Amino acid sequence: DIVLTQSPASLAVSLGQRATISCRASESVDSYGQSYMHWYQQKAGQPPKLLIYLASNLESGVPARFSGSGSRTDFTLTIDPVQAEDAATYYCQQNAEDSRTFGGGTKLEIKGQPKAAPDIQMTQSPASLSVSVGDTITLTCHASQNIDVWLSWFQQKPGNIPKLLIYKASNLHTGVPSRFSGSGSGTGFTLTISSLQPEDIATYYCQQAHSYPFTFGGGTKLEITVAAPSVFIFPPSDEQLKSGTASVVCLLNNFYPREAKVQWKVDNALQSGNSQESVTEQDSKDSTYSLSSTLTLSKADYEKHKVYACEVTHQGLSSPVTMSFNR
Amino acid sequence: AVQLQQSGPELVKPGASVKISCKASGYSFTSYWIHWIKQRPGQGLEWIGMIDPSDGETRLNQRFQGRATLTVDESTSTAYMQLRSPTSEDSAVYYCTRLKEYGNYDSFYFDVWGAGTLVTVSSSEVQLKESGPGLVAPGGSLSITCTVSGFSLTDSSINWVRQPPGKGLEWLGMIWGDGRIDYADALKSRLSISKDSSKSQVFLEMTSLRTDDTATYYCARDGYFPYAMDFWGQGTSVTVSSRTSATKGPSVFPLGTAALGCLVKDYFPEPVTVSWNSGALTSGVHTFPAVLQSSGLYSLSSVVTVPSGTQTYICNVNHKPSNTKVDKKVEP
Missing domain, CATH: 2.60.40.10 (Immunoglobulins)
Known part of the structure; x- marks a missing residue:
């Protein structure tokens, strides 16, 4: 059983430098002119990935920066230049014998001190908005740090390319209608569409050009109140009934407003029993809710009845809807 | 007149060395930096990097530095973005744009853009899925299952490799397609490897479990000669306590x-x-x-x-x- 000793156990390297990890073997790893020595790269919380095989061959999709050399008992892996995504633990491995072994590892981290600088964070609130045609509308934008007036405002129609609209916070790009307008400085900027035409319906972006890397805003969708729940009913699976339990789940997908009644129908008999409700929060996209009702009861009370329903009372529904199943 | 023409959509499989062009015309290619912006359906717009067509200087985002590679040929007036080893995280629309400047960067912005290039990365197809009992007592027994998909156990070899917390990778054993089993000499006595080709499953058993058998247990498939371990599962944690x-x-x-x-x-x-x-x-x-x-x-x-x-x-x-x-x- 060949023992593979790695060196060093850890190394801190500056970006763009050379790093040379070693791996020494207790016995020769050579057979018929070949060194059965391979290198694996294991990033944090991740499975290993093959980098180099038979000491000097790169695997497909492995950058020309990784290289390996050595023979018999002395091997080396070199990364020149060292990049940010090269921080991982690196293992050498041998299959020169029936019983394969790995080395201890060499953890490589990019150093570390002096660190660097943060990246700018842009926010566009709300992520979605609605209004008529022929009205003035003000849109809002924000920056994490100072960008003075280095803010662009873009326009992307679905399945279309970004269209520059405003630059330097208040300037209008060429071909942009007078109805579009820009304002703001520092951390807070505003777009303004007076007497909005149907063409002004798209996702409105924003971008900082102060410090590298460049960063864009989340987004703001244009569209132009009631919503009935998409009512479904789920029966307990084959897996669950083997547990001696039966749970029927009434799904109420996307509804507005919140006021909604759900009533359980135990095979044509209305029975308020062993049930519990769950509910999502008021959305950002459509501000609708989602509700589940789970009537939990033993296979002793269930298996008898083969057909069950769910009564849903909502403003959106002219009269209550009752979703059923046949097993 | 001033245009940025991009190359077509990309059908990419994990580990590909995809290269997307963006030929610039109707202006002085050499005079403005060409930038690259990645979209993604559920994110927004992100900065990859930029290139100087006049000489060939580069500056990428720390993220895509060793990942993405920016090239320029002024004989063809084209800019390239060579992206190697992609994943279904790089499933995005890729725009090449120029940072046009007025009055010595009195105003600088992405005015002209390329049509976009949809780059799509495949869902592996070869899968290894470990599963087992999260917790187990000392002196007891561990029992893990590797569930394989997209290849057959009748002709592929499976390795059982563990990673104790703070320790290195330790090879446990292997099962060859012909049913030959190999073990680590040190843990030979305590290990049992077996498979069920029909069920597409591999199994490991370890006895006399002490707390130093607390590890992430992995299964890895051998590639062809030299038989290095080319596909790994995500691993399964086994903690050992009283x-x-x-x-x-x-x-x-x-x-x-x-x-x-x-x-x-x-x-x-x-x-x-x-x-x-x-x-x-x-x-x-x-x-x-x-x-x-x-x-x-x-x-x-x-x-x-x-x-x-x-x-x-x-x-x-x-x-x-x-x-x-x-x-x-x-x-x-």
């Missing part, structure tokens, strides 16, 4: 347009983490808050609205208090 009172949890049951999901029932203690396609599905998802049952255990449901048997739907269930992590699919 007590875990009490004890287990998370039982995963399956559940116009189609609505589908999963039920995570009777687990203690709370919480349970749920996601779909390892994160590659956050659209029309409703991960309902948990409710304390009659049985004193906790329960929740995770649903997702999707169109109407091609796209794969898998929920990633994690109940940390029991060292449990499970993945399951849904069908009618």
